[PDB]
Design a protein around this ligand. Structure first.
Ligand SMILES: Cc1cc(F)cc(C)c1Oc1ccc(C(C)(C)O)cc1-c1cn(C)c(=O)c2cc(-c3cnc(C4CCC4)[nH]3)oc12
Length: 108
């Protein structure tokens, strides 16, 4: 019986943020820098852990499921844009595994 959004900020996001593979997901995909003109046409709903952090810090979310959905969007965005077996995909898969472990200890 502890608050879920608190859990998401202090435990789930903290764990994922400190991970070795977090850096490409700590801010939006800069499509100009990387020269990716199709990224924002293909990806209708950009997401990254930076925005999720901002949202948790700034009372954006209606509930914990809306935040979980954003985490899931970030991962699937990455699997949609990139070929399977790309290194960015392997990094996301690792983050997703950890995400789902930490979620399965979520209070209620
Ligand atoms: C470009 C790149 C080279 C690497 F060796 C490793 C990574 C992770 C890598 O990806 C990124 C590096 C930096 C950044 C910054 C900091 C600018 O936001 C972003 C990525 C990156 C993050 N995410 C979530 C992505 O989905 C993709 C995708 C790509 C990418 C760049 N070029 C491609 C395709 C186009 C031909 C290869 N994909 O780069 C990123």
């Amino acid at each position: 019986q502890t608050n879920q959004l608190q859990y998401l900020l202090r435990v789930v996001l903290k764990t994922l943020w400190k991970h070795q593979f977090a850096w490409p997901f700590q801010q939006p995909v800069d499509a100009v820098k990387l020269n990716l003109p199709d990224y924002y046409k293909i990806i209708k709903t950009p997401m990254d852990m930076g925005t999720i952090k901002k949202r948790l810090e700034n009372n954006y979310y209606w509930n914990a499921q809306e935040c979980i959905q954003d985490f899931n969007t970030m991962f699937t965005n990455c699997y949609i844009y990139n070929k399977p077996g790309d290194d960015i995909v392997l990094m996301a898969e690792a983050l997703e595994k950890l995400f789902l472990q930490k979620i399965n200890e979520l209070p209620t």
